[PDB]
Design a binder for this molecule. Sequence first.
Ligand SMILES: O=C1CCCC2=C1C1(CCCCC1)N=C(Nc1nc3ccccc3o1)N2
Ligand SMILES: OC[C@H]1O[C@@H](O)[C@H](O)[C@@H](O)[C@H]1O
Length: 391
Amino acid sequence: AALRQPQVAELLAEARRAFREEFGAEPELAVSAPGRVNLIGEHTDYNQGLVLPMALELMTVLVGSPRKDGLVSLLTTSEGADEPQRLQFPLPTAQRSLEPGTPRWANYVKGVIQYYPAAPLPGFSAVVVSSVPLGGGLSSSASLEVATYTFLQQLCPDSGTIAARAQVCQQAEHSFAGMPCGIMDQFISLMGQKGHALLIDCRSLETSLVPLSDPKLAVLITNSNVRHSLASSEYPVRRRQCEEVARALGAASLREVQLEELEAARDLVSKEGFRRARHVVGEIRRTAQAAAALRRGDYRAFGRLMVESHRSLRDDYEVSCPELDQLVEAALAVPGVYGSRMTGGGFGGCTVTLLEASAAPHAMRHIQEHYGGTATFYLSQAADGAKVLCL
Ligand SMILES: O=C1CCCC2=C1C1(CCCCC1)N=C(Nc1nc3ccccc3o1)N2
Ligand SMILES: OC[C@H]1O[C@@H](O)[C@H](O)[C@@H](O)[C@H]1O
């Protein structure tokens, strides 16, 4: 079928074998950091909103060893990574900073090294592997940033907070990959816990670990296997718009703006800005309600909010695409599906469907038969965040 299994043990084994072959000795440590699915709370993180992601068993693993020579030597075995699959560079100094370039995959590692807060950081040799589909909407880059960060902590413990670590990975995304993301993806990669979703307040940086351990419930992720151009170009546009609405209203962020306020101050903002802000302010409220619904086990309300989230993303935020809309429509027509919506940034990538577990195999036959493109499926347990295994 189209169901990709996690193969976690195999990923680690692959990394270890490649390291020994590449560097001529066994690696001294392993780390991992997962990708993520956002259950609800889309395009809210950079608006100081609420998000409700969970970590996946899809993950990036670094296996490696410190060096004595102050240089960094990398190999990736990820099919999908751009050429070359190897890069070496000296550690940044006060004299010489790292710079983004070729290959792109290495920019994530370089960025985290560049902004790593603690000293002295030694050089190191590492292999990077991942089961997160690269650029497929499940935060492959955050997983790589966080796995890198986790590895650096083993080389040179930081004395820091989870938020500070997320901010470093976020800065690497902004500065080295030119993607001005919010904090969500890094936060969940760090903080995920098996059998939990994570409610993140992106204003206060308070987090709640919300149990998500009912075996009658399942989360089916569907990869559209498309990424439209607009993905890259439009994300900063939406973010730039939101900022303009806050400015016009004298609000520090949209989070401080209530829906009742928005309808009443509309003359002060543009028509399209109003629609973007209506999505955002609206989505923050839905996410709060969705978290509360999850706690009560009220899936119908959660799912209604989720379908509601898709419609808002499609019509008000305009970050869906025909492929996503179709995957949702297909899912939403199946009995026992509570909700389905695009997840992540949009313009391609994955949908997330919350549904009765027993209905999942009905979905996989039907989605494959009734989706225009090539669907890939993950049936995902809520997973752990960043982890270390000493080798
Ligand atoms: O081109 C894009 C579009 C923007 C999003 C995005 C990419 C590329 C960047 C460089 C290689 C091609 C795909 N990669 C990631 N993430 C990522 N690359 C990884 C390599 C090894 C392990 C984990 C990894 O995660 N994200
Ligand atoms: O919900 C939209 C999300 O888009 C992500 O892919 C981005 O990395 C996050 O920061 C968040 O803004």
